Amino acid sequence: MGKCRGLRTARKLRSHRRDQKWHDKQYKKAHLGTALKANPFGGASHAKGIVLEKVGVEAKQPNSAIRKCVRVQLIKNGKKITAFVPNDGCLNFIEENDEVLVAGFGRKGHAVGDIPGVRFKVVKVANVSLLALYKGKKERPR
Amino acid sequence: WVCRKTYVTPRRPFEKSRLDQELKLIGEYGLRNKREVWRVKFTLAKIRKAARELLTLDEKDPRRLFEGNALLRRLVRIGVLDEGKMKLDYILGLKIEDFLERRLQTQVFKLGLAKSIHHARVLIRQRHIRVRKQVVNIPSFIVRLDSQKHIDFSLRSPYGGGRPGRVKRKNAKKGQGGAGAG
Amino acid sequence: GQEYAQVIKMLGNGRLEAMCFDGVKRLCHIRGKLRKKVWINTSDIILVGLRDYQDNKADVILKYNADEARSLKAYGELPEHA
Amino acid sequence: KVHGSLARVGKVRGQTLKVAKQEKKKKRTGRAKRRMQYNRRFVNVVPTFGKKKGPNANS
RNA sequence: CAACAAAUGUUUC
RNA sequence: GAAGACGGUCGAACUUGACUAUCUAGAGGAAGUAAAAGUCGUAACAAGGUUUCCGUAGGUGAACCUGCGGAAGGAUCAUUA
RNA sequence: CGGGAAACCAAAGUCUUUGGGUUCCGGGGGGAGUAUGGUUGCAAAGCUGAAACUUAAAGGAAUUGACGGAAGGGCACCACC
RNA sequence: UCAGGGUUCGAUUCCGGAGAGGGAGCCUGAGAAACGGCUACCACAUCCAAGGAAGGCAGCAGGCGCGCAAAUUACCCACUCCCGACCCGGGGAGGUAGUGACGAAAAAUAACAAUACAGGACUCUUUCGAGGCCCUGUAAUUGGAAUGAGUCCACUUUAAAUCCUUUAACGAGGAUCCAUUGGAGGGCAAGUCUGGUCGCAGCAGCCGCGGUAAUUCCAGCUCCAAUAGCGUAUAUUAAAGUU
């Protein structure tokens, strides 16, 4: 029970807990403010940038495909980031020097699937929603 | 500007057994949606929790006495609850139908003046039903005991009297302009 | 509908050094259906896939033969010097 | 390690012969639709003890 | 009675 | 009874060094990482054909080799005189 | 008896029926006992000890084959003699 | 956020504290180290006939920049209160409308017979067969039976209006007065589909699918789930007895 049991010993128990909390990764991340300091997105949920170039990335085994992302300079902190472009032929819709709204995978910062070193996805261009673009609700305005 | 939610969804989402149960409730009870059921599963859980707390308290305990009796009296005014129940030991052993049974909709069936939990809801939502001086359009209502008798069609909706119907009255003048003259 | 290629060096593990007849050396990846019974060589003709991607690289899809090579003059692909 | 192509981008979407929309019915407003569900599912819905059956079956 | 060598390498499966 | 004015106190600000904290450019260099279908050796899961591994020191294309003291998580829970 | 995932364990028992005292270390695996500052050292090195990134299994135990240049093994001129 | 224990947040309708471009000083007055006072410097910006001169929206609107992200350059002191010499004036305090799917409440987009039929427990019959209650669909159209959503005399609201809550005259036969958004291989609710492709495009948080009979794709058809809402990303919490 690895832990005193004296009526007094609040301070030891209280503090021993403070000492071990660190190992928790979610906890440490939060106390070290990692999201502000390391992360490309601010510690925000979405982030907008300009498209530098279009990449065809080489999906990891045992899968085999060309992935199709763009490389993006985030306006907020000039950070360089590669982001996936989802659905069929949607690259089509984003051009070099584009602008785009990027969002996390939903993986907690950890890349997704077979898609290697890509941690973000495009959501908007034409300020304009790949979904609405892919469907043809709305266009590549211009 | 204070506000609160009135319903709670179930922890979990796909438990055939629960889904069927809810569907039977919607059907018997001319309900509209799962929320319609969820709202009541929620109403009930709070009542039961209110009950359970009380039941853990000492009897005669000014707090237990004063609020227990009140919860009971409230639960009885609406007919939801009955006397032997009408103590806390019995609310603990209670269920959703008991509430669901007191809404308008099912009463307008329950005395002929609808012949369907169906008919009932469209009747209510369409202004042909007063609870004695007052139209009530809320198929969702909760008919209090000594209020059971005052439910009836309204003073003007046609049944309830009053000309015919913006569509019946159309039909009267539908046999009038052509078949009468030119 | 693209050109071809010509293996120059070998790397290993889904990696091979090739020399596109056009004068472009890149690391091509074997093809999945071809690799089944095809083992690219450092001296042979091959076909790699390459689309909107600068073309700086390509993946191997199928292979070729040699004996036919003499016919390649007839293939209308290689010049009077290959 | 990327090199490769995109030539083929969007090859199936563009090769997938479009289909009409056809049409037909409206399905029903809120509670009424719940009612049809409950009768089709449960009243309907009698079931057999056929060792079961299905919702989106063909033959 | 005691003791004794040995390399590498093509596919979905 | 004003401007002004003697000397002082508070002291913004300015100029030059020191100090401390936080952040950030950089020719090049050397790690580790991915990793992975490559090249050269065979270093150490079956006693892996030199049992393995630890501490430590020197040395080697590269796995690794070797001495000195440990361990068995070994290939012995035994040795019958 | 009872414990434990089992191998096992009279302590590794008296642990969901979870509470005798006290002390220490761990929170998936790799990056790494690595970077960096402090400290100790003549030196070799020791103590304290991250991150970026990387990745969906790392690992334990038992069960069973397959297989062995492990032991008792056999059997056949598709094996030897 | 709910076992209980707990776990996390709190700028933000109240209280206490702090500031009004940055710093410092001061006058007045009972009360100020005040900036819708002043004064200097410091940083900024403006007018000028170039000597001068005047300024501070972390007030209300609005505008730039910033970004993932946030409304009218609108009406009124009538309510609620405040101030003054004040019953009487004045109040971007504050009310009032406009924008407003933060989010929360109520819950429309169709109910009832009839034929017509399709059917099942019940009864009768040796069986065939027939009757029968409870009814649900499903057409066939009927048939009578309906209500605001819009629209609109009148009236209400209120400072005056708006909307609500109020109503004469209109407003439901479906092709509508036309409901959506995700899913249907496992977890996971729902295609041992049809066309197309053939480890390609794509799908896939995870496991995994697709290499020519694809229940995972791409589309339809059909079906499920939540439903005037639903998907997605993210902080954080529950789950987590993985602090």
UniProtKB/Swiss-Prot annotation, chain A:
Q: Where is this cross-link: Glycyl lysine isopeptide (Lys-Gly) (interchain with G-Cter in SUMO2)?
A: K37
Q: Name one GO biological process term.
A: translation
As stated in the Swiss-Prot or TrEMBL entry, residues carrying the post-translational modification 3-hydroxyproline are P62
Q: What GO molecular function annotations does the UniProt record carry, in alphabetical order?
A: structural constituent of ribosome
> Where on the chain is N6-acetyllysine found, per UniProt?
K135
Annotated stretches, region: Disordered: 1-26
Q: Which residues carry this modification: N6-succinyllysine?
A: K54
Report the CDD domains cross-referenced here: Ribosomal_S23
Q: One Pfam annotation, family name?
A: Ribosom_S12_S23
What post-translational changes are documented for it? Hydroxylation at Pro-62 affects translation termination efficiency.
Which UniProt key words apply to this protein?
Acetylation, Cytoplasm, Endoplasmic reticulum, Hydroxylation, Isopeptide bond, Nucleus, Ribonucleoprotein, Ribosomal protein, Ubl conjugation
> Could you name the domain of life of the organism this protein comes from?
Eukaryota
GO CC annotations on file: cytosolic ribosome; nucleolus; rough endoplasmic reticulum; small ribosomal subunit
**In which residue ranges is the amino acid composition biased (Basic residues)?**
1-20
Q: Where in the cell is it found?
A: Cytoplasm, Cytosol; Cytoplasm; Rough endoplasmic reticulum; Nucleus, Nucleolus
Q: State the family it belongs to.
A: Belongs to the universal ribosomal protein uS12 family.
Q: PANTHER family from the entry? A: 30S RIBOSOMAL PROTEIN S12 FAMILY MEMBER
Instruction: Provide the assembly information.
Output: Component of the 40S small ribosomal subunit. Part of the small subunit (SSU) processome, composed of more than 70 proteins and the RNA chaperone small nucleolar RNA (snoRNA) U3.
Stated name of the protein: Small ribosomal subunit protein uS12
Name the gene that codes for it. RPS23
UniProtKB/Swiss-Prot annotation, chain B:
Q: What does this protein do?
A: Component of the small ribosomal subunit. The ribosome is a large ribonucleoprotein complex responsible for the synthesis of proteins in the cell. Part of the small subunit (SSU) processome, first precursor of the small eukaryotic ribosomal subunit. During the assembly of the SSU processome in the nucleolus, many ribosome biogenesis factors, an RNA chaperone and ribosomal proteins associate with the nascent pre-rRNA and work in concert to generate RNA folding, modifications, rearrangements and cleavage as well as targeted degradation of pre-ribosomal RNA by the RNA exosome.
Question: What is the name attached to this protein's record?
Answer: Small ribosomal subunit protein uS4
Does the keyword Amino-acid biosynthesis feature in the UniProt annotation?
no
Q: Where is the S4 RNA-binding domain?
A: 102-176
Tell me, which GO biological process terms does this entry list?
ribosomal small subunit biogenesis; translation
Q: Where in the cell is it found?
A: Cytoplasm; Nucleus, Nucleolus
Short name of any one Pfam family annotated for the protein: Ribosomal_S4
What is the annotated quaternary arrangement, including any partners?
A: Component of the small ribosomal subunit. Identified in a IGF2BP1-dependent mRNP granule complex containing untranslated mRNAs. Part of the small subunit (SSU) processome, composed of more than 70 proteins and the RNA chaperone small nucleolar RNA (snoRNA) U3.
Q: So which domain of life are we looking at?
A: Eukaryota
The record's family statement is: Belongs to the universal ribosomal protein uS4 family.
UniProtKB/Swiss-Prot annotation, chain C:
Major place of localization?
cytoplasm
UniProt GO cellular component terms? cytoplasm; cytosol; eukaryotic 43S preinitiation complex; eukaryotic 48S preinitiation complex; multi-eIF complex; synapse
Subcellular location per UniProt equals: Cytoplasm
One GO term of the biological process aspect: translational initiation
Does the keyword Cytoplasm belong to this entry? yes
Write the record's keywords in alphabetical order, separated by commas.
Cytoplasm, Host-virus interaction, Initiation factor, Protein biosynthesis, RNA-binding, tRNA-binding
A molecular function (GO) held by this record is: RNA binding
Q: Which residues form the S1-like domain?
A: 1-65
How does this polypeptide assemble, per the annotation? Component of the 43S pre-initiation complex (43S PIC), which is composed of the 40S ribosomal subunit, EIF1, eIF1A (EIF1AX), eIF3 complex, EIF5 and eIF2-GTP-initiator tRNA complex (eIF2 ternary complex). Interacts with EIF5; this interaction contributes to the maintenance of EIF1 within the open 43S PIC. Interacts through its C-terminal domain (CTD) with the CTD of EIF5B; from the location of the start codon by the 43S complex until the formation of the 80S complex.
Entry function: Component of the 43S pre-initiation complex (43S PIC), which binds to the mRNA cap-proximal region, scans mRNA 5'-untranslated region, and locates the initiation codon. This protein enhances formation of the cap-proximal complex. Together with EIF1, facilitates scanning, start codon recognition, promotion of the assembly of 48S complex at the initiation codon (43S PIC becomes 48S PIC after the start codon is reached), and dissociation of aberrant complexes.
Q: What is the similarity comment for this entry?
A: Belongs to the eIF-1A family.
Q: Give the gene symbol.
A: EIF1AX
Swiss-Prot record, chain D:
Q: Where in the cell is it found?
A: Cytoplasm; Nucleus
Superkingdom of the organism of origin: Eukaryota
N6-succinyllysine: residues bearing it: K51
Function text: Component of the 40S subunit of the ribosome. Contributes to the assembly and function of 40S ribosomal subunits.
Subunit relationships:
Component of the 40S subunit of the ribosome.
Q: What is the name attached to this protein's record? A: Small ribosomal subunit protein eS30
Taxonomic path: Eukaryota, Metazoa, Chordata, Craniata, Vertebrata
* Parent-protein start and end of this portion: 75 to 133 of 133
